[model samples]
Target chain A: REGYLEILSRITTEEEFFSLVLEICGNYGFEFFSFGARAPFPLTAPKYHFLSNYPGEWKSRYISEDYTSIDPIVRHGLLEYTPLIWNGEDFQENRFFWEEALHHGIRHGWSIPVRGKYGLISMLSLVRSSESIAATEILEKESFLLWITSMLQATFGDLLAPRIVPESNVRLTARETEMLKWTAVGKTYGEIGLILSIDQRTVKFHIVNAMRKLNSSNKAEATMKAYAIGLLN
Target chain B: EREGYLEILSRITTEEEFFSLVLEICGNYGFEFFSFGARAPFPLTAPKYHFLSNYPGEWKSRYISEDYTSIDPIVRHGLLEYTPLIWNGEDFQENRFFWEEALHHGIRHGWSIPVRGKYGLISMLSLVRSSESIAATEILEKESFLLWITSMLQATFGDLLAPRIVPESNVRLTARETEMLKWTAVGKTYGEIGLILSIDQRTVKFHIVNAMRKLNSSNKAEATMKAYAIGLLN
Candidate 1:
């Protein structure tokens, strides 16, 4: 633990962070590790960070092919809380992606998902070249692994926030936030005006102003983005 | 780890079973008290919370009656920050009375782990002891066991306490429905969406209705929230 903290205290770069993580992988007898953090809003241009120690060719292929969009592990981490252990199998439509990964010597992996503030979701994957992670081994190591994932998210998620998160200066008026709040829960302009005792046009004005402030093209984007960045709360 | 998982997976059913397990864990870890709580997701007029704890009943009542969830800095930190927190009395100066009362009830010198789950579910596990102040090194040393324990707690109690949207894991929207919902989410009216897609207003409404039905949402906004929550929008 002291050694881990010593290394952590000295990490000031992404490469250092990767090495610290890779050291953990090596200690656990794994050949590869991947850490991914996905920011939840503006889905069309969603912000994300991907770092891994997999083969160079496969890494480029994964990105160039945009496989993160279709990766089941990524999707699962976003929605579920369980640690997934797989042997490059059980994918139906995404089976081809897994096959390519297997071809690149990526097999037998465990992934832990961590959901955090600001709609941030992260996944830490440990992979070996061979040897399925047995159930007994998983039971033994799961807690330690979860601890590692939690600390990684706590430390790195904060550093990555300023870069991948929305602008900190974006502020919305209470009325504008009120209008978006109502819109988020499915209220129409007329309905919100009725609820807030304002004119329909006035409601539209506030929402439009909010949309402009958030750099959103419409009220829906504004509201979702606001919620994602904790502006709505 | 194996023992805890087995107990949680095979034996835990009621709140008592869960609390006893937590109590056992606290004993093993030298914590005299513990509280596990999960907060419901957004858009509600009032905060909804679910809790299981071995805390003093008097303090628990006070916390609930005063709506401390809004006033407690620990909770605010958990809501907005991902890091574990060790309580510092100095930081509670703004909430002097809350801090005083907490210590008055044997809530002193402890830390909390905040666990964020899908659909904005935020759960926190607090382990407390009357003595022994905590530090970063200790937190780093014990966070793994604490986190694993909290994950087990969330896995066991999440659905029962913090109810979210329907799972709808297999729901898929058609291209038309997806496009219409995307435009709608951006605050476009049906007529505007119709113009953008070169379809009639009625067709835009048609696709939206289908999308809402598939999402099991009663309205466009709810459908959009659900879609976003499930990554359908992404």
Candidate 2:
């Protein structure tokens, strides 16, 4: 019962549990693994972790080339909320992701979908270099995946902290502050000019004045300073 | 003009009265227009807080009836921060929705203030003036009185809109269901739950569905409320 409860607590932080699973699989003499949540093209994929054993070259190439649009596993996984075990035949059929997997020596894998609120879905997957394990054996391990996913949800919840807007002591003119708010959210000077219906040169002049007043170098620095002074708050 | 305002200030009590007083003040200042709106993103809908203006009763009714409050940048910015905001016809032009609506209403310049409460927020106090010279300094000089009125409006509105008696007692959960609900309120999902309790994934789903049925809740938020009201959660 204590062991059962320990597993329950571990689910709150799924990444740690995933690492433990990696260790457990390693003890069973398996090598190679990758896991991440699917959030959509640009935002999908996990952040780089120093502890990850996945090849650096593979990670960079996948990101630089934006292979997610073409990756078959990701394509299939997005539509289903169950686990899929990819082996020789599955790889041969997919072909696109299979070549990449083969190039990296990843011969077997399991991918599971975990549904979340408001259609927010994520995947937890594991891959190894051999296809020895049978389908029934993998099916029997559903409890393990379930617990890990639950813990991950809890852990991710804890990780979400409210964004802190800076409280700058110095004040800017209301127009300047409003302009800065737009800039922080990626609005351009011309866009700001169009929004305020002011001359484009006037918009630049306001930004320059704000930059000097805040004693900052660039737009990004000025924006950060504005936030720090509570000008944006 | 100040003396005329002093006469109107002597009769403020309820939210309705306060709104009336605001309208009177706006009318005296030759800017007889105002609106209020609120948004709750978790639930995904925008609701307006009554708007009154001298732009013409027909125009005001048309804007509010069709829910043009959703597209108002003044109200949107008000919820995002605690600041006094001013926008003119040009700013409205950026939002196609607002642009079309304002053209119909003949709105030229606007002044707005956002009011934030404990759990949610109140986007109150937006007015359009016929004249375009109503600068930020003019608004700031009147900040003290405007903030006072905003606070009263928020307090009164909150009293009316706040959940009456902790709307969470509809569910009749089992011990395990209660435990799972507690974890969920703390923001746990099923997979993490399985690891913690050493339960199967299916078992977690079973418990969750049981709680959902008992509480008469179709979604997580209602279920959470039911658990809280029943003292099932910490």
Candidate 3:
């Protein structure tokens, strides 16, 4: 790990950094690797970076098809902590997606989720086209890949946005937060008013204030945004 | 890496399962002792800290009674960064006695990995053995393995911890009450806050008191801290 520690500090460009990452992946016997980083705020449309060394045709096709919305690996990485070890067999539900992936030389893979400061989430995936990964091989390589994922997030999470805001720029009043939390848990505005011994109009007033503060188009969006950023917690 | 390990981890629902898993990790890595601590991102006024360890019973009591948390370098380091910290006794300053006592309790040498998980929960896992000193080479070789285990620990237990760490305050402050507490947190007296908001001093105190009652706080300081902790004042 120290062998590349000093070298990383000297790297100055994204292209050079990814090239070095690709070299490391190659040395580890993988043909493809992808790193994704996403900011946690702006629940509607957050900043994101998706870097990969897959075939150009597949990359374009994946974007055009919006495969991220349906990719199980991406969904697992967004919420879970463990590395997902997957093979073509795991994609039985998405046969066409798997077939296209195989056509592009993507087969077996492992992806590790990395959650960073202020709730930024990232994932690092290592993939190969041939030879199913055996359990022994996973045992030998999982730690190294986990380390790589953490390092990639620490380095690139900063580089992705050298300048940014704090955890969130939106601040809700105590009443608004309470209202949103209730709304998030499926309480209607009229019901929330009953629980709080207030009129329904008062509930709407606070929810509207919260909606404006969160820059959300509706009460549901405001509630979700607050929960995502921990304002409701 | 172990077959079905991730599935097994996700299925765990009780502390016994987690304890057994930690012991398994220690046995696999040849460590004699292990400890993990976590704190959720809420209730910052009195952050609820959870700890699980297999240290000597006597040492555990002493450490708690002495409140070593206020001085432990590893805990402090975990709060600030996500790096793996190797405790070679060098990081312990102004608290040499604490280190010596820990050594007396068989906590001779070890490394700690801090993990930042979803919703800003922070946790640290430390593995130690009594005999060998941890060198830089060992750290370079083992840091990744340690980090993996730490992250798994956080993921497995984070949901269980959330409700316990966060308060059930259900308290809401009005716009005026929130404004008063924000100014009070910055050391503004009632008169100063009144001038800032163009309200009377007594009215400022009234709103502050109203916030205190809602937050179940005794005074301005406690009320301000609770508001900040629960994200009312931001």
Candidate 4:
């Protein structure tokens, strides 16, 4: 606890904290690292991270090939919240994931699943080339894993805060801002125009312009981006 | 004038045109009455305009002057849902609104339609008749009229042009404003935030004010809503 607080106090930015975490674990015989957070159902792509050591070619191939849909660890991780250590034997048992892992020369790994608020889930993984260390030793260090998860939660919660910027830094205009507010309240453009005493065409103009400035493909994406950029808060 | 109104209604191919037609119809009806009851208080109940028809002007004046909408069965019923309703004295006489005031005004029947949008109930359309029995079957037969009017209302008032429109000005926030907004969403107060970031409260206030102005919001709630919609809150 004391060491954790010491590290936390010294860290100034979230990026620095994450870097420190990776470094600490590297010293403890854990090499490859990956983190990802699950979104609601029907969403194919969830926010994920892979360490620099994970070959870019392999990562690209994995995503382009849609390997996650059949990855056994991912499948099992989605179903359970507990941590698991899978050895070569376990990998061999799962034909699909095993073939892929063996093809890539990947052997042993640990998976920790976090069930969070409102059905939000996350997975933290560590993979090693050798299986010299026993799985029981790592499982016994559950407190350390919990500490890491807590840190990640804090970082993620902070990332979700609204309005952390100046007006000039945001890309939306005053009219565009008003339209977005009404949009969130489920107001159609025509209704918003009535409330604002503007032509409906003008309302549409503001929204579309706002979308372009935000670089959003759709309103939902724009809304989330706006929230992230502190434009809404 | 009725022919002209019908022509305008017939020409409505889009939702906006339909809404404008409904408003135009209401305006035309108001002009015919000559009493200018269109600007009546919101959530209108018994606000009425007298016409040259057989319906008594005395009853219309009494209904509007006394603001009987509060006790009008039709208006009260309209508040319950988005669908249209047609009610006669027999259908609502036992209800409190009908028994207490509608009967007193000689309002024997009425047609009520709720004007609802994505943001809950906006308004209502109610046409009343005095000393006349209105059958539910006849009301159902006029469902098309009610639907047409409702569609017109949405087109005129609901903002169908939004998805296709774009603004002229290229407004964008500075880097500092973006960072500050992010912290604000995390529930950080201005002073606490300033202290944490090594900035002054007054500077923080300036950024917030600028954000409000840029977003065109007069208040924090409006600003927040805009931020959420624009994906700035992420």
Candidate 5:
């Protein structure tokens, strides 16, 4: 559980750290592992990045076609706490995508959705080419993998979250910050306007600016994101 | 960051080696004592957990005998945060004997790093000093060095230990009720949630209302927030 905790902890970059994670996956009997980190905004399509040990051909296709848009693992992973199973069935519109994964010698897999600090969401897939290792049986035999997944996700999220978004530099203006706090307290825009002595349009103008600046889908998401990043006190 | 990548390449092996690393962390930072702990979310009744410490042997024995875990401010504040709080004995307003006894035992001047990890698992790693006031923990706040250490310690311990941590586990929520609270937390309206799983506004609210009662919460937000923080969602 304890990595080299004190030895220049932050000096470890993404590549080196991720490489270590892959090595751990190998030691733990996983043939492959794919980790995905997703931003919690712009609901139509949140930004994401991946580090995987799957074959290069499949990896390139996944990126070029942007299979994240259609991956059932990605979609179901975003909301639920339960781990999802991926097989030949339930491919939705991405049947070829599932088929291709098998062609790469990746057969069965289990992915646990991980939610990290500041709402950084990540899904870690631990897969097997080992025929004897059934997902359900392996879960019983090696439940420790769940904790390993937690460690991996938390560590990876901490290292990669800011780099993935660079949204750390997005500063909220004072008015926008104020509006978020108000909205969080469950105030309607008109109510906030009344409280601030600004009319609805001015209040909305601040909200919209904050939304765009935060890259949020709506006031609620912007409010949550703003609070998470300490942009709104 | 990867200076010790070769070491991390293998699976976690010895508790002593990990402890020695923590000891080295203390040595560099000028701390006299350090402890790390992890609590997993499972069994719902007597879940898995454990703690390791290098405080004085006498103090360690005394802590367990006196039942300090109940009154320990470090555990309380560490599990509950966003205050990003780093606290010591002074925060134990309601329990002065436990505070004074700990102080009398040369166990004073403490700070903790509370890690709220994935799948609702929570852990805390704390360092204390016998010398005097420790340096303010603010030094590591932004860089999150302590946070990283706490994370890995929990990870390592969590993987190695058998499931079962808290001796006082209380199974309070049904699977459906747990799901209801989680959905409520992520911004689902009662009517909206009703259409989904448990069928209609009736059973949804019933599950939610029943969940809140079990959680001992008075309202929706508190119920949801407390459950989320307490890792009922996991």
Candidate 6:
């Protein structure tokens, strides 16, 4: 842990950050390292940002061949946010992909997949040209590496990737948020009106606009959709 | 966000430390309540559970005594996908007990995030408020901060938690469904997988689509992602 923090204190920029990381990662027994962060939306050009010290040719082949189109580990990393060690056997249908990687002198690997609060998802893969990596070693060190990659990716994503930050100008008034809160809790119109000291029919002022803005058919669905989108939260 | 590296690592060493951290985190984010739970993934071998929260004390006791864990929908959702989701009593359809019962305790609005880990472990982090949501601008920005802490929590605490006692996905996939999903995770196109598995392209589509529906995926990518997320493909 001290070793990790010592390495972590070295720098912050992506360029120089991973250089010392290369040293520390090498100490972790992975001679080659690659880290990739994926943005959830605008899944088009520049959807992924990555850094690696793997063979130059291997990196080119990976991107040019569009191997993300069939890379099991990429698929695995996307779905599972845990740290895992994977070898040739995990891929059933895509044996060729891994075999192709091994052919280029990339053998075994360990991965840290982390999903953060926002839509940012990233995987840090540390690979060696030889036999195996154990869970004991990886698990013991994961929390250290997990945030390292998470922080790096968080910075790198904001630093480099094009963000389609969803527009958040839409909103509901506090009255709407309040009414929806009660309606969400199974209160009927009459009961809610009695609680608020307003006419039962007056509840429609909040309820009706909420349904239209929320695009719902009934109060229940309106309540559900509103809370889901933060319109009524 | 950068320098707190040391503090985040130390907080999850024990649940007591984690609760205090959550309280501090909530204060910073304008939230009063938080809930986090983890269900072990290797249920067949060593099933276990972990839960931590700063909700009202009596509500915590009632939540357990009522056996809400058996039917909590958010826990149900975390097992399927690593989606940042939100919910309230209105979202409940069948297990109205968990919803109405929870709201009766002051959990009016909630946001949940499914923190995924290696080897199929999923820990859920939920931040809630009594009525109004957090300040508007801060809520969206909260995702950025939340993801970091979620990852940090999993890093320190996830491994120490229990294994899942119940299956995340209740659907029992057929042998063919499982096989199809494994290929999907390999990035196989429907036609290619069909040829490798020795069936027609159309038949390949049928099986893959069927399996995805069974897994509750809205589409192919999500199907494969969710399937692999739960370790069904492994």
In candidate 6 the C-alpha lDDT for residue A42 amounts to 25
lDDT of 3 by residue, A32-149 (tens): 9988776664432345567899999999988888888677787667756668888865777879988989887789897888776444578888899998888789878878778777
Give a tens-digit lDDT track for model 1, residues B98-194. Answer: 9898888778877788877645567888888888778767776777677667766776776554434334435788988887877776678988878
Off by over 4 Å in 1: A1-18, A44-48, A90-93, A139-141, A154-163, A168-179, A187-210, B88-91, B135-141, B162-180, B191-200, B210-218, B230-234
TM-score of chain A of 2: 0.52
What is candidate 6's CA lDDT for residue B175?
A: 76
Rank by TM-score, highest first.
1, 3, 5, 6, 2, 4
Provide the fnat value for model 6, as a fraction from 0 to 1. 0.08
Say what the interface RMSD of candidate 2 is.
Answer: 20.8
- DockQ for all models, in order? 0.52, 0.01, 0.08, 0.03, 0.04, 0.06
If chain B of candidate 1 is superposed on the true chain B, what is its TM-score? 0.80
For lDDT, candidate 2 versus 3, the one ahead is 3
Candidate 5 wrong stretches, greater than 4 Å: A2-11, A84-95, A132-144, A169-178, A184-190, A193-224, A227-233, B1-234
For residues A1-233, could you state the per-residue lDDT of candidate 6 as single tens digits? 34544544555567776675587578777778887766543221225667889888888988998887677777777755656777765566867777778876577787877664334567788888776766467545655676566555555445444332231223677777767767654467787788889987788788888777755566655554443233431
For candidate 4, what is the DockQ-based docking class?
incorrect
lDDT of 3 by residue, B1-234 (tens): 445567788788887788888878876876889888776654432355788889999989988899887678888778756677877654467689998888887786787888766445678888888878887676666666677667778877776565566442357689888878766654567787778879899999999888887876666655665565444643
How would the docking of model 5 be graded?
incorrect
Give the poorly placed runs of model 2, Cα more than 4 Å off.
A1-233, B1-15, B25-30, B40-42, B45-55, B64-66, B100-106, B163-182, B185-216, B221-234
| Residue A69 error, candidate 6, Å | 1.8
lDDT of 5 at A24: 63
Every model's TM-score: 0.83, 0.38, 0.63, 0.33, 0.47, 0.46
Clashing pairs in 6: A81-B117, A82-B117, A82-B118, A83-B118, A116-B147, A117-B147, A233-B133, B40-B163, B40-B164, B48-B163
lDDT of 1 by residue, A20-136 (tens): 789889988799999978876656456669799999999999999988878888866777876889778656677889889989878888999887656677899999878879878
Candidate topping DockQ:
1
RMSD of each: 3.8, 24.7, 12.4, 22.5, 11.7, 13.4
> What fraction of correct interface contacts does each candidate retain?
0.60, 0.00, 0.12, 0.03, 0.00, 0.08
Question: In model 1, what are the clashing residue pairs, if there are any?
Answer: A220-B185
lDDT of each: 0.76, 0.54, 0.73, 0.51, 0.64, 0.64
The best candidate by TM-score is: 1
